[PDB]
Write a protein that binds this ligand. Structure first.
Ligand SMILES: Cc1cc2nc3c(=O)[nH]c(=O)nc-3n(C[C@H](O)[C@H](O)[C@H](O)COP(=O)(O)OP(=O)(O)OC[C@H]3O[C@@H](n4cnc5c(N)ncnc54)[C@H](O)[C@@H]3O)c2cc1C
Ligand SMILES: Cc1cc2nc3c(=O)[nH]c(=O)nc-3n(C[C@H](O)[C@H](O)[C@H](O)COP(=O)(O)OP(=O)(O)OC[C@H]3O[C@@H](n4cnc5c(N)ncnc54)[C@H](O)[C@@H]3O)c2cc1C
Lengths: 484, 487
């Protein structure tokens, strides 16, 4: 009666969440398809998804490793004595540790499969034959052998994204975040291309594990890194990355990349400037991975960028085909993907239609120092509200007056509908800002006003307490006009 | 008009808050009185309060310093190679840096007076002659040169608390937290006596800067440390302190302390056990400091413990006399004192009456690892509601599988009113919990329900997103009784 109730193409953040719930909560027959069961080349992403394999999880362990550079230095101010010149970072050991951590998660995923009735794993490239037939092929090649044919009621596309490349000569000389997780040795000289959070987090990792004398450049075609983040936080972070040895190059981009005789690369920038590096990592952006799904065989509509068009309930134009996650180019974050997956199951296997709310979604940038952001940026709120008030506060935590890192300022900016004092967005820069922003997200989701913040008794001493001592605005926007 | 509109006895968190406001916001003549204007012996506290001089500020700087011991060690899992046997704590460097830090704040406070017409600093022991006259004597002795008299409309008593002593033979060979901030060398062996947060935070500061081979014991007469904090957290913190070398000695109390030839202290416990230590620190409590204010002259009613009885608006029994901060013995934390100080200026000077809410105040304990809590512990909620749900989650963060400090579990416990799901209390144990608890406090203020928490999209990866992943109760309390499920 149709072999399967569900066929999920992609065992990622969204796919596993949708699959597990349908199998377990609604006892459906679910086939989940993915390229491999363990992280690593050639596919990189595997059972568990981009996050577990080549994303959030390994990035966090690496950024954590990267942080010890700073703390070893800063411990001096507090009377900690050690042979500082003997200190050496071992990348090879970091990666070893990380690999063991990732494989362990991969392995736990397999157990889940054995532990669940109706949930089965199928290896191979999934593709569509029509709206009820999912092919499982040995390669992405549209005419490689078919390993399996899956007859199904519903189809859930959850294939993720993939690293964008630039069309320049030598692009094949560059690596992406995927390969970066497997580098044999830390580059001494490195170039991260791209102004987004992934580029920035990698400059930070490289910057700490590089050999004495190394250098990390960060190129970005635009005028200021992290497009879309609070502009004031953007300039500030630029300054602190610079304070730590990262050469931030706005208005730069490779034009040609050539391999030198020693292995190293050579880069010629659109400026005319040239430079040589051990590794050139593109982190220009991510693009929806729907190119080999044969979506046309089912009549599924897609956009110029390959994103599968979905409605609030993640349904494509074909009623029995749903699509969640990065492949939908809505909000490319794991928790969002997971929510959309849970909502999908509610919607189809429980008749309780739920749409994921893609607003007030908080996020963090694990740069060193990290960012924790949520809600509107001044600019956007200004174009949607009468008059908005912007509150701002900065300070150098006391410990940093003693540690050496005087450049390390903590900043909190809050944006509000000045008419009713509703908090439209809260943006912070400084350690702990990712942990802090989570609960702030609950506030924003609840409709919190600025008087809800300053009326809560502070916790002292913490950085977070600054959130509660902001009673007067710095300036305003009246009709998109920058006022007072 | 009288000489002054207000005279503030105590230039601390609350007093200074009130003084500056009445002065800089209503343009009133306000005199503020403190014993000294720079931190240190013999009075320890000074202009800026207990927090600034020998409390919050220096204890946090010194806990940060203490953390480096775990940080340096944990760095190995992540590939940091260094001569491990070369790591050495230098206590005198820490003390000097803390000293430069505090003096600087002591200085800024000074500047604040120079630039506030109306705000005036006086120096000595403020005491009362009558309800409109306060004396600033030279010393605590009533037989002291009355340095000055100040005629005044309103009096604000904001003198704080002071370490509590034991009355045992040898108490004078012991120290309290005031002296601990000035020790010349880290003790190799130390006895922290007390179960509250000051004793715990100090046990971890000493545990970190001690000479190797050294040892820190925490002794507490009670059954479990942190009386008044979540029971599970209390249990879990104890094991984590034990994991890092601290000897938690429960049902233990010094019976007598004599002096050793080498100048260490020999302590005989009520149990009969005996041990030697370099420093015996008493952190058994803090008593409200109202004993030398001559309240009997202005007729202010006082508790048995010396607490100065006030009403919701902090007014005493004599209508022109207010008391705020630790001396009222309500919630002894800086932000509460500050909040009570601003409440008072609104009430008296702007006729906009305000009562500080002493409910749902978030607080943190800077132990290693730290705690951050807000709201009711489940035992109190069960007395008030017929059905209460307790949600729980604990996980070893991943970084701790690599760092090797495998014992550092993050624990999140939420207690709700099951009738409608209102969050009654949130309690966390783990790194970053002081920071996370601040925003949670904002939710609780607003009346958040558990649904509000789990309907929020998480930030990944963080320890905090765990707050948004708890949808099923662990157990409940039905009419005060613990139950596995509501029947
Ligand atoms: C370096 C990096 C760091 C990131 N850090 C964070 C972070 O800290 N926090 C955060 O929230 N987000 C982070 N993200 C983003 C996050 O990983 C994604 O948003 C999220 O994983 C999207 O999940 P998904 O379910 O859409 O698909 P994915 O998790 O990407 O999984 C899709 C799966 O489908 C498989 N697949 C693709 N095509 C086929 C096919 N034809 N047949 C079979 N299987 C196929 C892929 O192998 C993949 O495993 C990061 C991303 C990157 C690249
Ligand atoms: C070790 C330690 C750590 C602490 N850590 C924290 C923490 O991390 N976070 C937190 O919120 N709280 C903490 N506290 C508590 C916090 O310091 C107090 O709750 C707060 O300072 C109380 O403020 P107050 O205004 O009541 O009085 P205080 O700040 O104590 O100020 C009272 C002032 O009055 C002066 N004074 C007293 N008597 C007289 C007199 N007769 N004449 C003139 N002047 C006089 C005193 O010198 C003192 O300066 C800590 C306390 C201690 C002891």
């Amino acid at each position: 009666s149709r072999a399967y109730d569900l066929v999920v193409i992609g065992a990622g953040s969204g796919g596993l969440e949708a699959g597990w719930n349908a199998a377990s909560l609604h006892k459906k027959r679910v086939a989940v398809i993915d390229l491999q069961k363990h992280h690593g080349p050639p596919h990189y992403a595997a059972l568990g998804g981009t996050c577990v394999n080549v994303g959030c999880v390994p990035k966090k362990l690496m950024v954590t490793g990267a942080n010890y550079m700073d703390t070893i230095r800063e411990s001096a101010g507090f009377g900690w004595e050690l042979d500082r010149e003997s200190v050496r970072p071992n990348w090879k050991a970091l990666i070893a540790a990380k690999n063991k951590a990732v494989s362990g998660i991969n392995d736990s995923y397999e157990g889940m499969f054995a532990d669940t009735e109706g949930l089965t794993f199928h290896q191979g490239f999934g593709a569509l034959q029509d709206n009820h037939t999912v092919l499982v092929r040995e390669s992405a090649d549209p005419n490689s052998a078919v390993l399996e044919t899956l007859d199904t009621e519903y189809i859930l596309l959850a294939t993720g994204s993939w690293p964008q490349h630039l069309g320049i000569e030598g692009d094949d000389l560059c690596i992406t975040s995927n390969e970066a997780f497997y580098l044999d040795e830390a580059p001494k000289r490195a170039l991260c291309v791209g102004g987004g959070y992934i580029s920035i987090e990698f400059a930070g990792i490289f910057n700490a594990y590089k050999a004495r004398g190394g250098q990390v450049d960060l190129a970005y075609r635009g005028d200021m890194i992290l497009r879309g983040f609070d502009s004031e936080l953007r300039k500030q972070l630029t300054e602190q990355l610079r304070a730590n040895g990262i050469n931030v190059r706005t208005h730069e981009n490779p034009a040609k990349v050539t391999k030198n005789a020693d292995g190293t690369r050579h880069v010629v920038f659109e400026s005319g400037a040239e430079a040589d590096y051990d590794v050139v990592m593109l982190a220009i952006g991510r693009v929806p991975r729907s190119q080999t799904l044969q979506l046309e065989k089912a009549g599924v509509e897609v956009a110029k960028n390959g994103a599968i068009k979905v409605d609030a309930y993640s349904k494509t134009n074909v009623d029995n085909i749903y699509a969640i996650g990065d492949v939908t180019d809505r909000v490319m974050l794991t928790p969002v993907a997971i929510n959309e997956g849970a909502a999908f199951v509610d919607t189809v296997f429980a008749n309780k239609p739920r749409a994921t709310d893609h607003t007030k979604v908080a996020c963090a940038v694990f740069s060193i120092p990290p960012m924790g952001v949520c809600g509107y940026v001044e600019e956007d709120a200004a174009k949607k509200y009468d008059q908005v008030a912007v509150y701002e506060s900065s300070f150098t935590p006391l410990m940093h007056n003693i540690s050496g890192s005087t450049y390390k300022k903590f900043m909190v900016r809050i944006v509000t509908n000045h008419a009713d004092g509703e908090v439209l967005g809260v943006h912070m820069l400084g350690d702990s800002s990712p942990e802090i922003i989570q609960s702030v997200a609950i506030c924003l989701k609840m409709g919190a006003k600025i008087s809800d913040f300053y009326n809560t008794i502070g916790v002292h001493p913490t950085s977070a307490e600054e959130l509660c001592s902001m009673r007067t605005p710095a300036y305003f926007y009246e009709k998109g006009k920058r006022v007072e």
